[PDB]
Ligand binder design. Sequence first.
Ligand SMILES: Cc1cc2nc3c(=O)[nH]c(=O)nc-3n(C[C@H](O)[C@H](O)[C@H](O)COP(=O)(O)OP(=O)(O)OC[C@H]3O[C@@H](n4cnc5c(N)ncnc54)[C@H](O)[C@@H]3O)c2cc1C
Length: 295
Amino acid sequence: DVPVNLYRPNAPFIGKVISNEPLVKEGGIGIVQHIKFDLTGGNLKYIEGQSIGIIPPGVDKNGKPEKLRDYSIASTRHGDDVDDKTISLCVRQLEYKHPESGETVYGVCSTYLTHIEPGSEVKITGPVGKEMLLPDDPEANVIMLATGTGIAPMRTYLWRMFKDAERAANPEYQFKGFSWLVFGVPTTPNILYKEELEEIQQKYPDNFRLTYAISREQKNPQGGRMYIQDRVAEHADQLWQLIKNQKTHTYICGLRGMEEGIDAALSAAAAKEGVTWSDYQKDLKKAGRWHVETY
Ligand SMILES: Cc1cc2nc3c(=O)[nH]c(=O)nc-3n(C[C@H](O)[C@H](O)[C@H](O)COP(=O)(O)OP(=O)(O)OC[C@H]3O[C@@H](n4cnc5c(N)ncnc54)[C@H](O)[C@@H]3O)c2cc1C
């Protein structure tokens, strides 16, 4: 039922870019693009929580072809237009430091993708992933802990849950549980999909809670910058109570290293009731209720 490896690196699907939109508003930090591809002409199917591979053009420094990079799918199974013809990605351009040979370094695949033109052909493989899948139980609670481009799988869940067109397209899934996104970004113009996230929250104030951790605008109790582990510590007892429900699924996505501050906060909460969090969490992973994808 879960499509996997419909296309592989030795014979990739050749899609076409339909659009390439900026997500970072003026005054923000960096470049994050929303890129939509045309899937017509092939049989690429996917569901929510999966990834695809992109094979960038060119050779490395040794003259060898560039390998694929993985990207979380940022659209539901139906695509943004709910026509089952497209797939979207949420791609940040990577760039960095002088302690790494010379001046500024730009990432190969992320630069390629963020500057790609409509009409261009792209090599796509996949889909892959069974770790970040959404339960078909419409009464599930869904906690979502994302930083930056980790919003991508969260967007596929929330759109499936709350978009009018999706609800009309998925008769089997009419969500009536509770979902909570805690979203860590550096500035307000860096809140990816801010307007659509806040529109969901106003239509479904009982089913969706939105919490931001904006580090350049908010300070934590110790006077430091507000990060997502600070918000999670702030709400640790509430999050723990929701996690005790047999229906609750937790998803964590973003850059590696966000997991340690989340566990330290949930450990202190669980300890209050004599529960050892690290042992409890192993049973949650075994049960398929604890989903992690950091990179
Ligand atoms: C499952 C999965 C899902 C992903 N989803 C997404 C997504 O939705 N959106 C997205 O933008 N990315 C996503 N990523 C990362 C994406 O995989 C590519 O790794 C990332 O875009 C950078 O690739 P690059 O090709 O731009 O190239 P590269 O040119 O390959 O650069 C990466 C290399 O440069 C180095 N490097 C990186 N940062 C620094 C730093 N600050 N200081 C020093 N050296 C550094 C490391 O050696 C690293 O191997 C995902 C990764 C995985 C594994």
